[PDB]
Chains A and B, each alone.
Chain A
């Protein structure tokens, strides 16, 4: 239209004001955000002793999903189910027969850290899952070595929150199975073999090779330019 005419702008470097731009890379983040980001950077810039970085090698998404699918079949009795079973016991044990035998043998996953460790070294645990994001890392550093010594399959799965949700809790440091249904024996054996080949059979040479020797983006570019 003749009434409409173009007005190109020449922002440049020494003329009319610049327009609005995204400054996410330059914003002054809250002190806690910067502190946590710098902590994350430090955790990767410093040489981590071998027991550290033994985590961060996590079960692949396919095998982790298969393991979680198998575990979902053995979630522990929830509050509503617990109340239903209590009512059944109070209406059958005293009014019927078979003291405490009215209900069948229960099967559920084991997730208590102290209880899971107590199950190991006995030993009855068949499969163990260890969270890789436990803030007090010392709580789980010995679990891989303990499982290796006891010959119990173990996997370092990603996310304690996922384990907790799998067991009706906010978070769970570990999860394990002690007794499983016969129908799932083949699946349990396959998962155990895969987890062993991924972690147990590999955590004898991986005990060496200190990790954490990763430089930053700017440092990486500078060293690459210097080498070139």
Chain B
């Protein structure tokens, strides 16, 4: 018995995939790990001035990385707490990230610790 004139395809059971062999036999490692997220610090005069007068670090970041990954890499590599992250693409084809540290951390101290000033 049916009360509608529109016949529809029955919702048959669909079997879940169960391949007999591994798709690639090896899972790929982290393509954008913390070390890969950050490439090199920027030591431009304006960047150095921002370090002391703004408590903001300037780093070179891979194009694939985003704000979340940049923040995670900064926190993990240096144990620093990041207030905010700003990023831009330089005219030379590289990404520049402006990372602001919280009041509990000093940009100059971390800059000295890493080994640049």
Chain A residues engaging chain B, CB cutoff 8 angstroms: 20-24, 26-30
The number of residues on chain B lying at the interface, defined by a beta carbon within 8 Å of a beta carbon of chain A, is: 7
Chain B residues engaging chain A, CB cutoff 8 angstroms: 1-7
Q: Tell me which of B3, B6, B7 contacts A22 (CB under 8 A).
A: B3
Contacts of A23 in B (CB 8 A): 2-5
Known: A22-B3, A26-B5, A27-B2. 8 other contacts (CB 8 A): A20-B3, A22-B2, A23-B3, A27-B4, A27-B6, A27-B7, A28-B5, A30-B7
Contacts of B4 in A (CB 8 A): 23, 27
- Check A21 against B3 for contact (C-beta < 8 Å): yes
Nearest CB in chain B to that of A19: its residue: B3
| Most chain B beta-carbon contacts within 10 A, residue among A20, A23, A26, A30 | A23
Q: How far is the CA of A28 from the CA of B6 in the complex (A)?
A: 6
Nearest CB in chain B to that of A24: its residue: B2
Contacts of A29 in B (CB 8 A): 7
Distance from B49 Cβ to chain A, minimum over Cβ atoms (Å): 75
Nearest CB in chain B to that of A33: its residue: B7
Nearest CB in chain A to that of B3: its residue: A20
Distance from A25 Cβ to chain B, minimum over Cβ atoms (Å): 10
Distance from B81 Cβ to chain A, minimum over Cβ atoms (Å): 64
Contacts of A30 in B (CB 8 A): 7
Q: How far is the CA of A92 from the CA of B7 in the complex (A)?
A: 64
- Check B1 against A22 for contact (C-beta < 8 Å): yes
Q: How far is the CA of A21 from the CA of B3 in the complex (A)?
A: 6
Q: How far is the CA of A56 from the CA of B6 in the complex (A)?
A: 35
Q: How far is the CA of A145 from the CA of B13 in the complex (A)?
A: 49
Q: How far is the CA of A24 from the CA of B4 in the complex (A)?
A: 8
Contacts of B1 in A (CB 8 A): 22, 24
Distance from B8 Cβ to chain A, minimum over Cβ atoms (Å): 10
Q: How far is the CA of A26 from the CA of B6 in the complex (A)?
A: 9
Nearest CB in chain B to that of A26: its residue: B5
9 contacts between A and B (CB under 8 A): A20-B3, A22-B3, A23-B2, A23-B3, A23-B4, A24-B1, A27-B6, A28-B5, A28-B6
Distance from B5 Cβ to chain A, minimum over Cβ atoms (Å): 5
Distance from B43 Cβ to chain A, minimum over Cβ atoms (Å): 73
Nearest CB in chain A to that of B1: its residue: A22
Contacts of B2 in A (CB 8 A): 22-24, 27
Contacts of A28 in B (CB 8 A): 5-7
Q: How far is the CA of A55 from the CA of B6 in the complex (A)?
A: 37
Nearest CB in chain B to that of A21: its residue: B3
Q: How far is the CA of A20 from the CA of B6 in the complex (A)?
A: 14
Contacts of B3 in A (CB 8 A): 20-23
Distance from A90 Cβ to chain B, minimum over Cβ atoms (Å): 37
Distance from B47 Cβ to chain A, minimum over Cβ atoms (Å): 70
Contacts of B6 in A (CB 8 A): 27-28
Distance from B77 Cβ to chain A, minimum over Cβ atoms (Å): 63
Q: How far is the CA of A21 from the CA of B7 in the complex (A)?
A: 15
Contacts of B7 in A (CB 8 A): 27-30
Q: How far is the CA of A23 from the CA of B5 in the complex (A)?
A: 6
Q: How far is the CA of A20 from the CA of B4 in the complex (A)?
A: 9
Contacts of A20 in B (CB 8 A): 3
Contacts of A24 in B (CB 8 A): 1-2
Nearest CB in chain B to that of A25: its residue: B5
